Amino acid sequence: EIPKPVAPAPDILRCAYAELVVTDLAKSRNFYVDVLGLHVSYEDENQIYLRSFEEFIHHNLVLTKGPVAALKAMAFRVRTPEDVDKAEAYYQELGCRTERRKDGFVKGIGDALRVEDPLGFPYEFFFETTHVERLHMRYDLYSAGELVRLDHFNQVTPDVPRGRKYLEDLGFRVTEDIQDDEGTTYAAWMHRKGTVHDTALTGGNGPRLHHVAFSTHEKHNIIQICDKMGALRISDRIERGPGRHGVSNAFYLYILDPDNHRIEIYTQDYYTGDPDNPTITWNVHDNQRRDWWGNPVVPSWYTEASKVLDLDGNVQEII
Template sequence: MPVRHPAPTPPFNIIRMSHIELGVTNLDASRKFYTEILGLIETEQVGNSIYLRGLEERNHHSFVLTKVERPHVIRLGFKVASEADLDSMATYFGTKGMATGWVTQHGQGRSLQMRDPFGMPLEFCYEFAQAERMLQQYGAYRGCHPQRIDHFNCFTPNVQASHDFWALELGFRTTEYTVSEDADPQLWAIWMHRKGNIHDMAFTNGAGPRLHHVALWVPTAMHIIHLCDLMSTTGYLDNMERGPGRHGISNAFFLYVRDPDGHRIEIYTSDYLTVDPDLEPIEWQLRDPQRQTLWGAPAPKSWFEEGSLLAGANVQPPVLQAQPIIAS
């Protein structure tokens, strides 16, 4: 059960996770949920795609909602430090026999696409078209005042293998992790970052690869409380899945909601800084009641079983059968 710490430095520099494209079945319903309820800013609609961003974000988009027949995740996006890093990535993974390809996406510069060993659809880019920063345009604030996209969490059939690739090949650094309570402990979940907070990417044991959730960062816990009041009185009570509460892992205050197609969104704040290169990862036992929620409340069964399909990825059963505490 090795945690690859510290992660090696690859010949390219991934800055952070940066964007996601979600396939949705009803653009009008999705627009209302993401802009009027959550509070994202609509940059524009082009064809069957709506481009959204957080209040402090100056990139053209961090969320893309595209009309599809069946809901799924189309791509998980990451920003690199320079155009040269994209070329270095293409060369690096080409020498390893991994397929890569260049694509053109609306609102961003040339973009490199590839898949991780389990088939997750990944996209890397440097340049985005720029949009107005709305941080001080307080009249535009709605919902929970979402400032920016923060992280992905994905189900994987093999947490150790996913961690090894993302640490050894992509240079993601570990902050916290969960192990099974076996004589030979196995990785059950892991939190990894590039930007200096708890995570840009987390992996959770389960049938996968699938997206567990994408997170929005908000200013305070009270913005999450306000969202609970808003959703419960505007017809979205059943869309609140878990929380509000405070995680043991990450210390973050959270709420998990589901969009009209069932994609899970975490509303997230109050984690901590992890930029020091000698920061030691924190280990948690799988059945520690404070691991999921500092206050001891376990998550519902849906939180461990349901997720969004990823375009082109074949779902595999998990190799580890260890069970967390589940709310009755």
């Protein structure tokens, strides 16, 4: 069991961006910018910084060229600069390795703390970030499949109850979960910002990052992503969907980037910000928890997930 620290938890606002290592930067740019339409805040021959339509911070996704495709960091923004010090004290009390950089790990982020969390994931906590043009009314740039916000991460770990306790002490609130008759948690969705989730834990060999997710404004935007991929003759990169998830009630689509990192695009959220928001518990034997309409099962969705890196940049051993 991971103990609850005496030190106070940092006040986490929301998931904010992911840094993914990619192997061929130009092929990754073709996918994220030309196919998906994300906006380039900054790029060079080593990295591409991308943001969604409604974002004002510098980026939601950093693509970094490297040797092995993997998640390098899943970042959460905290409420105040002092919260980065709180995160540092917190994870040092849990006995985790931490690295602090007053001027950031990537461009457009200031004082930041990266840690190898108890579950083996590279989390980053930061407050300072370069504000850029919020594109929410730039309808002259709006694409038929526009990604409007980054919403959440989904993590694969072997012991979900152990991880759930740790995230709950960190302040995440479970909105939905999947349990058996004994009441054991098999998967949990948890939030800070008032939507179904900022991250989710699902059981399996780990640490691995199952996906990063963006939303669209409407369902037709998701359908357009599928239609565009079929016209580009890359429909084999659509993994699962479109469908409706029972858990989260999202209309979803999962596609695969050039290094096989899985990106979820979905639409339809509901408000979870009240402190007594009713947790929805789904039975592990209820098929509708996975697909409200009964869509056939896609096996790779249960077997494949991205490697994650430690603070030296090496792949974390998968347990």
